[PDB]
Design a protein around this ligand. Structure first.
Ligand code: HEM
Ligand code: HEM
Ligand SMILES: COC1=C(OC)C(=O)C(C/C=C(\C)CC/C=C(/C)CC/C=C(\C)CC/C=C(\C)CCC=C(C)C)=C(C)C1=O
Ligand SMILES: COC1=C(OC)C(=O)C(C/C=C(\C)CC/C=C(\C)CC/C=C(\C)CC/C=C(/C)CCC=C(C)C)=C(C)C1=O
Ligand SMILES: [Zn+2]
Lengths: 387, 34, 28, 116, 420, 487, 116, 100
């Protein structure tokens, strides 16, 4: 055809890019509600940025004023209790949605070819989310914030030769002080914008080949436009998420947290119980299961190494767990193991939790060690199960 | 024999039966629910 | 002569929305 | 042999469970092999007769329609399914052998995966 | 309002026409420059006005190949006085329809509308023919649509074969294709079309036939726009000789086609032409055709058959020509074809379009519209001897063979020629 | 010194085109004095004077209608019957088409050879055509053979034999046609459109019917069909041309004596089994076909609904066009302009089908696969625009074109005869041209907007598509495009 | 009019300065009318014969080459330049006349600009 | 398609079918209608019924006869012995070719 005249405005150059990437993008027609958590994570990121920008209009990154400015947000600025609870609980909702998003990708093997770059960009995003949420938790300058920042910056001391100098360089001195809190605030305003760019590249990598489907098969024969079919399906999830979010904000604003952060930071006395936010507990558990300084940090790095090497293992040509009974069973054991690790991290370091944490850590790493073996053995399934 | 699609194209059906697992149709000729 | 009615109809909506977002009942 | 179902009852249970899952959707095991996963699958699929690929594509569309509707094939249609009737493994093995021969002789590959 | 089954109230009904209307008389006015204007009054409220020029592919030779067909495509385009857009809008404002046809020896431009819009139809029709703009972009667009019209020609085996045997049957002007090849379309431009039309479109070679209008009104509008044409002494149409031919375009595959043709007298010799038409009705894919020109004609038999049954097909077709020539046709069949000829001609004269085109075609050729009753007498005089003698002479003179499709199984021209 | 403006090849060519343009700059007013591009509503009741159409209802309810032109040499006479596939049953569906095949197969007096030889002895033509609601048999003969043609028609309608061997032979011809329903996809797209739009109604069935019905057709089934439907009060005898009303009426009284006289009436059949419109679609995906053809239709109006005339004007406003039309970029129809300017279709045509109690209004188009998206936008935009913006010039020009087309298509005895028969069946009378033009003239821009708002705006649609139609917009996209959210 | 060089001497200086600037690059005034500026120029250019458009494109490539090189045309070449010899204004005016006639009668435009 | 560019071969091919009747009129260059129906199994049936030992000659210029026989015999002695088939007869009739 000859585009002499102007047809629908969506096909004009002003909005052609948005039309092809959002309104008319071909999507498998059999996508379930487990494919709606990507938009949920995007909405959570926007909520965190919007509430955070307005909270930064009232927050002071000074050790003499940080705690009181948060309390001034809660008590003085109109609706400031809502912005603070939306932001504090929004970080928990962001991790809940992203954790469900990662497990959908494990169950349906969405990391497999040709979507290896999508999974790898997701792992980078996950690291950015962890660093962003952690340094944000230091900003209120409570007892949890101070002792939380003390050890994470101390993790660099595991390096033998230059470990101490990295710790003092991260601190900006010889202890967690106003220098640490001031630089954590600047990075907490910047990393969320880097997260936006990483998510856009994440989205762009996925659009190269399209989304995976619950059956794990070629889907080019039954694709439909994202608008309005998966827009109205995502809208149901957004409203359902809002009800979930509203329950936490208005009726249980402090259940997903610890009361120790409501005590101003005291560098003299550590609390008897010292734990991170709940979404960091599984990493806490793997760290504490290794009875070594360097070994604990190495195991933490090995978690992200195993997540990065997952798409590149020589695997069988079948994706979905709905046709892989052995892999499907291992997935449910891995999910139960990740739940156990989070519960273990909330426990003090003593019997029997030391033995349980060590076994749970081994089971977690066994999942990534057995999956390539399943692929190599499973390659001969079509040649052994004959009609 | 003839394939199913060729029979459908060659023989219009005025008594189409739709899939009813998820949605039940209103009786034919009912006013639109717009 | 329906563009004029379209403008008047949308003007009512703009007025209705303005009184809805900003609710100056204590100012009128 | 451990995976052979005629000997290992665990392998027989594994074959049976996979057979029911495939039968519910009218899919064959070769239908699970997607041409975007491996460039050798794309090459093997391109060498197959048209009616083979047409039938595969029809089975994929039927299965995707059933998945969308949250229903399975009717029990009468499930009885005539052949989940493990093979059409692709022999072609795929031939393509893999040809690729290995080219590698052994130092030739350029006939096709390469685009770097994402 | 009221439903359509109840009469509408307050409508002024015109008085009805009489059940027996006097048929009119053709008035032919000849202008000093040579243009002839003819019109008849018609009771029906529709008018058909046409301009017929004695120009076609017999005047393309040798450096205007494709001009006649492009002039038909470039009909009613932009002129020197009105654009294409304006011209289309003026026709649509009065609810008119325009048409152009191009043949080997004639071209026509017709417009049809209600009789109350005659001055607009006459003004528009004359302007388009007398003053064509021939804009380069408009010519190029129609030349693009020329190629698809030529490319599709292989989808009509009867049409494709008819042209092919015309080229293979004649030697000279009539062998010039009516659908020029792609090479001959590249050289065609606005300057060539202007030079072609100015050389051939003269007052003495044009007839303005208008069925369904008073002569006074038609003369009052047309004369002021046509008298300016210069007097160009009438020329002689080029002569075409008939020879044999063997068209063969092996495409292969399936579904062959063929057409075996012979020479019959043209529109002149006003007694043997009727025999050709009755012969066509007598013979009546498998059928017969006829394409008669001013001084020559082509009578032939079509046929499709099967790719390997072709040898039996030409044998079977040739046997019928021999069978009629011998005299194996009875009186019952002759009266059957005699009645079909009479009914077809009379039934064709029901349409105002055919009647108007019959006026222009007959005045362009014989300068006078001959009464149909003279033709009807010629039909009702033919005996079995006349038909057999005619066919006997026809199959004796050279033949024109043309096949299309799978021709490997089709027999040689010499074997087809020996059958007769 | 620079060259003169003819030395260089590019300079010389620029002078030629500049001279041609100046030639077009000065028009001559001799050829610009009558024709005008502005549409004006004209009243010419005087020219539409036409021969009287005489209608006579016989004692048994039979109606004889004639249009006398004694100047003509030929005539067209035939029978128009209020019967079709709509008035059959599900089990009897296809009998009307079977009857059309067997109606010229010989009677008690005349065998098949006798029938054909008689007709072509006088050079006559016998035509039979059956549709969903109408059936017609008519003959085109010379003036002298009107009486003979009437005798032939009355004999085949009343004394047909229906031989067992002929039924079996004709059973195979139709069965072959039912397996060869191809090569005319226009007749197939519209057949599927009727099937899905008029679901579970008599109007949704096809004329051919199912293959099991033709397999079970016997002599008694055909005789029962004639006895049930071919009744005196459902039949109209129409003659046009060189025919005298008295002579036709006298011959009709003599020949059409043994009619069925079954008390079944066409108004009661429509009332008891009404036809309703159901929004739905059927998509026949076939990527081997080179062109895609689809039809989108709204529910239309019946024959006697006064809005049907406004729908005819609206149909002329959308127009019709194919690639071989010379001036598609300049016509008044915006939909045709969009299609012709951007070359987004092979052909486009608006249709307005009327039935006894309902109708179909829509657009049929043929296009390549890659043109389907832009074509669908253009069709829905221009159809929906009828409910928002209607220009007086566009409605006047469509009024002028509808008048001209309705009178310029009435050329010949055969078109007049069917106009007499069709109107006597659908309206019960022949609408005089003056009244028809006065109803067309009453459809102004406000009338078009009101009618479009009633039938088009925010209304369900029926789509039937075939070919490479993967890029054709789905039902929800078509449904959304029936209204504009900016108003 | 004041833009008439013969009547107004200020316009004579304006025309002389423009001619001198154009002559340095071998450009005609109609070569400064770019088809991307509006669709009427693009339509007018598409209607021109190929030999004129080819010559316009070559003068534009010569001028862009001179401008890139920080050079002017040689004085020998500058003497044969015709900066104000027209090839587009008449066609542009006709295209504008046709556009206005379409608008006056209520027809759709033959071409529209893409919304950027 | 790249055959009409050479009027030598096109005319030489054309006059072979236009001058002969029968097997020698069968074109060496098949048209774009018999290529769509050609396939590998059609080719196999042609070879098995035409490539027989009685119609095969193994000619070597530059080799001796002993070692050539030593290699070729194990690879050709297992061909079935089929009776020679009579060559198909072609008849010259004369004819005309034309292409505008
Ligand atoms: C550019 C966007 C952002 C800005 C400007 C921002 C700013 C802030 C500020 C000023 C605070 C201290 C006030 C308070 O404690 O409530 C804070 C706390 C926090 N932010 Fe953000 N933030 C942003 C994005 C994010 C994101 C994306 C996350 C999650 C990954 C996040 C997680 C947190 C957490 C967990 C806290 C501590 C909540 C608590 O008080 O217990 N922030 N943020
Ligand atoms: C900032 C947080 C994230 C956002 C906004 C995000 C967004 C999205 C979106 C919109 C999609 C496509 C629609 C869908 O399948 O849900 C998607 C797909 C995907 N994401 Fe994420 N994602 C995020 C984090 C992650 C993480 C942490 C991983 C795991 C390492 C991951 C892995 C994937 C995979 C594998 C897919 C393809 C899923 C499929 O098509 O089956 N994403 N993401
Ligand atoms: C009891 O103890 C503990 C806590 O406490 C309560 C915790 O919360 C956590 C939770 C921490 C987790 C899960 C890991 C956090 C991971 C990282 C990588 C944080 C390290 C990053 C920092 C300090 C800021 C990044 C600094 C940068 C980029 C430097 C900037 C430089 C330039 C731009 C040039 C754990 C494990 C813990 O055991
Ligand atoms: C078929 O394709 C599509 C999907 O399936 C792959 C989807 O899942 C979704 C729904 C989910 C989306 C888009 C999640 C993406 C989230 C991201 C990148 C993080 C948050 C987004 C931000 C901050 C917007 C940044 C983008 C721009 C252009 C900057 C301007 C924006 C603002 C000022 C707000 C959409 C619309 C989609 O089409
Ligand atoms: Zn039929």
């Amino acid at each position: 055809t000859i585009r002499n005249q102007r047809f629908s405005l969506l096909k004009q150059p002003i909005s052609s890019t948005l039309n092809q990437h959002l309104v008319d993008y071909p999507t498998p027609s059999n996508l379930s509600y487990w494919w709606g958590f990507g938009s949920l994570a995007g909405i959570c990121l926007v909520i965190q940025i919007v509430t955070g920008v307005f909270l930064a209009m009232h927050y002071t990154p000074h050790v003499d004023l940080a705690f009181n400015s948060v309390e001034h947000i809660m008590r003085d600025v109109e609706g400031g209790w809502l912005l603070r609870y939306m932001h504090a609980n929004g970080a928990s909702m962001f991790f809940i949605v992203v954790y469900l998003h990662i497990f959908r990708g494990l169950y349906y093997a969405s990391y497999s070819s040709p979507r290896e770059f999508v999974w790898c960009l997701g792992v980078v995003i996950f690291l950015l989310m962890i660093v962003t949420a952690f340094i944000g938790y230091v900003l209120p300058w409570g007892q949890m914030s101070f002792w939380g920042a003390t050890v994470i910056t101390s993790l660099a001391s595991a390096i033998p030769v230059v470990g101490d100098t990295i710790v003092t360089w991260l601190w900006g001195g010889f202890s967690v002080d106003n220098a640490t809190l001031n630089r954590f605030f600047s990075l907490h305003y910047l990393l969320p914008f880097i997260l936006v760019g990483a998510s856009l590249l994440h989205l762009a990598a996925l659009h190269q080949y399209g989304s995976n489907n619950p059956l794990g098969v070629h889907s080019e024969m039954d694709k439909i436009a994202f608008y309005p079919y998966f827009y109205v399906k995502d809208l149901v999830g957004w409203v359902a998420f809002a009800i979930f979010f509203s329950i936490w904000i208005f009726y249980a604003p402090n259940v997903l947290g610890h009361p120790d952060n409501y005590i101003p930071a005291n560098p003299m006395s550590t609390p008897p119980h010292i734990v991170p936010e709940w979404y960091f507990l599984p990493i806490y558990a793997i760290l504490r299961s290794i009875p070594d300084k360097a070994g604990g940090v190495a195991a933490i790095a090995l978690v992200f190494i195993c997540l990065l090497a997952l798409p590149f293992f020589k695997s069988m040509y079948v994706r979905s767990s709905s046709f892989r009974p052995i892999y499907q069973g291992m997935f449910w054991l891995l999910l139960a193991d990740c739940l156990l690790l989070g519960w273990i991290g909330c426990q003090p370091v003593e019997a029997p939790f030391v033995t349980i944490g060590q076994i749970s850590s081994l089971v977690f790493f066994l999942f990534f060690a057995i999956t390539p073996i399943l692929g190599r053995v499973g390659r001969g399934i079509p040649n052994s199960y004959t009609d | 024999e003839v394939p199913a699609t060729v029979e459908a194209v060659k023989t219009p059906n005025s008594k189409i039966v739709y899939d009813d697992h998820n949605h039940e149709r209103y009786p034919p000729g009912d006013p639109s629910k717009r | 002569t329906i563009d004029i009615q379209a403008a008047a109809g949308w003007g009512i909506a703009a007025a209705a929305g303005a009184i809805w977002v900003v609710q100056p009942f204590g100012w009128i | 042999r451990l995976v052979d179902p005629r000997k290992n009852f665990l392998a027989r249970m594994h074959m049976k469970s996979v057979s029911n899952r495939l039968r519910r959707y009218g899919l064959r095991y070769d239908d699970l092999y997607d041409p975007l996963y491996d460039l050798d699958i794309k090459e093997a699929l391109n060498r197959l007769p048209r009616e083979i690929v047409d039938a595969r594509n029809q089975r994929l569309m039927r299965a995707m329609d059933l998945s969308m509707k949250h229903e399975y094939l009717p029990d009468n249609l499930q009885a005539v399914q052949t989940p493990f009737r093979s059409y692709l493994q022999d072609m795929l093995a031939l393509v893999k052998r040809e690729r290995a021969e080219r590698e052994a002789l130092g030739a350029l590959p006939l096709y390469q995966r685009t770097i994402p | 309002l009221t439903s359509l089954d109840m009469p509408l109230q307050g409508v002024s009904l015109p008085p009805p026409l009489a059940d027996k209307v006097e048929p009119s008389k053709l008035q032919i006015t000849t202008l000093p420059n040579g243009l002839k204007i003819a019109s008849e009054t018609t009771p029906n409220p529709a008018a058909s006005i046409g301009l017929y020029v004695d120009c076609g592919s017999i005047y393309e030779a040798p450096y205007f190949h494709g001009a006649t067909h492009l002039l038909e495509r470039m009909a009613f385009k932009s002129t020197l006085n009105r654009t294409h857009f304006r011209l289309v809008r003026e026709i649509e404002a009065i609810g008119g329809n325009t048409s152009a046809s191009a043949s080997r020896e004639q071209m026509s431009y017709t417009i049809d509308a209600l009789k109350t819009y005659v001055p607009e139809m006459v003004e528009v029709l004359i302007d388009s023919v007398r003053n064509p703009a021939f804009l380069d972009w408009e010519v190029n667009e129609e030349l693009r649509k020329m190629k698809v019209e030529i490319a599709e020609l292989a989808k009509n085996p009867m049409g494709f074969l008819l042209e092919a045997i015309h080229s293979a049957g004649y030697s000279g002007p009539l062998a010039s294709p009516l659908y020029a090849p792609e090479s001959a379309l590249d050289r065609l431009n606005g300057e060539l079309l202007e030079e072609f039309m100015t050389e051939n479109f003269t007052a003495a070679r044009m007839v303005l036939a208008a069925s369904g209008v008073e002569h006074e009104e038609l003369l009052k509008v047309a004369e002021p726009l046509t008298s300016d044409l210069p007097n160009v002494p009438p020329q002689l149409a080029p002569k075409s000789q008939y020879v044999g031919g063997d068209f063969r375009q092996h495409t292969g595959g399936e579904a062959t086609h063929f057409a075996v043709a012979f020479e019959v007298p043209g529109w002149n010799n006003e007694k043997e032409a009727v025999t050709a038409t009755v012969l066509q009705m007598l013979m009546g894919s498998c059928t017969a055709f006829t394409s008669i020109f001013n001084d020559t004609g082509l009578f032939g038999i079509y046929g499709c058959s099967s790719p390997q049954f072709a040898a039996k097909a030409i044998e079977l077709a040739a046997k019928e020509l021999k069978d009629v020539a011998g005299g194996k046709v009875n009186q019952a069949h002759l009266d059957r074809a005699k009645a079909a000829t009479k009914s077809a001609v009379l039934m064709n004269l029901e349409s105002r379009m055919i009647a108007a085109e019959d006026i222009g075609r007959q005045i362009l050729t014989y300068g006078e519209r001959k009464p149909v009753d003279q033709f009807l007498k010629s039909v009702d005089q033919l005996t079995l001897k006349d038909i057999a003698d005619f066919t006997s002479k026809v199959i004796s003179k050279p033949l024109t063979m043309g096949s299309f499709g799978d021709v490997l199984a089709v027999p040689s021209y010499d074997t087809i020629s020996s059958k007769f | 010194s620079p060259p003169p403006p003819h030395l260089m090849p590019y300079d010389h060519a620029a002078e030629i085109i500049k001279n041609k343009i100046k030639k077009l700059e000065n028009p001559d007013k001799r050829f610009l004095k009558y024709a005008s591009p502005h549409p004006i509503l004209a009243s010419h009741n005087h020219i539409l004077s036409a021969p009287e159409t005489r209608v006579t209802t016989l004692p048994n309810g039979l109606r004889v209608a004639t249009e006398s032109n004694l100047s003509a040499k030929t005539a067209t006479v035939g029978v128009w019957i209020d019967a079709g596939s709509r008035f059959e049953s599900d089990e009897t569906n296809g009998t009307a088409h079977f009857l059309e095949h067997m109606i010229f197969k010989g009677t008690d007096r005349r065998t098949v050879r006798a029938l054909e030889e008689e007709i072509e002895d006088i050079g006559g033509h016998l035509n039979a055509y059956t549709s969903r609601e109408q059936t017609t048999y008519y003959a085109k003969v010379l003036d002298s053979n009107v009486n003979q043609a009437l005798d032939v028609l009355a004999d085949i309608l009343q004394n047909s034999k229906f031989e067992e061997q002929r039924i079996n032979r004709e059973r195979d011809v139709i069965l072959r046609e039912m397996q060869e329903v191809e090569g005319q996809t226009d007749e197939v797209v519209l057949d599927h459109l009727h099937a899905t739009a008029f679901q579970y109604t008599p109007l949704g069935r096809t004329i051919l019917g199912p293959a099991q019905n033709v397999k079970s057709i016997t002599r008694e089934d055909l005789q029962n069909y004639i006895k049930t439907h071919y009744t005196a009060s459902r039949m109209v005898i129409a003659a046009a041309g060189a025919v005298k009303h008295e002579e036709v009426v006298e011959q009709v009284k003599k020949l059409f004596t043994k009619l069925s006289s079954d008390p079944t009436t066409t108004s009661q059949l429509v009332a008891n089994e009404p036809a309703s419109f159901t929004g739905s679609e059927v998509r026949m995906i076939d990527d081997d076909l080179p062109l895609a053809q689809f039809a989108v239709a709204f529910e239309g109006a019946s024959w006697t609904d006064p809005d049907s005339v406004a729908l005819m004007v609206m149909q002329t406003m959308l127009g019709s066009w194919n690639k071989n039309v010379g001036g598609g970029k300049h016509v008044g129809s915006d939909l045709t302009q969009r299609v012709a300017i951007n070359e987004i279709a092979e052909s486009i045509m608006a249709f307005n089908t009327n039935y006894k109690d309902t109708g179909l209004f829509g657009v049929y188009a043929v296009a390549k696969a890659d043109c389907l998206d832009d074509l669908s936008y253009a069709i829905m935009y221009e159809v929906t625009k009828l409910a928002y913006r209607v220009s007086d010039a566009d409605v006047t020009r469509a009024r002028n074109q509808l008048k001209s087309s309705l009178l310029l298509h009435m050329d010949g005895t055969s078109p007049i005869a069917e106009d007499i028969g069709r109107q006597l069946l659908t309206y019960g009378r022949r609408i005089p041209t003056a009244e028809l033009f006065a109803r067309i003239d009453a459809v102004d821009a406000s009338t078009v907007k009101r009618v479009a708002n009633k039938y088009i705006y925010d209304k369900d649609i029926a789509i039937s598509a075939i070919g490479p139609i993967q890029d054709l917009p789905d039902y929800n996209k078509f449904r959304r495009r029936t209204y504009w959210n900016r108003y």
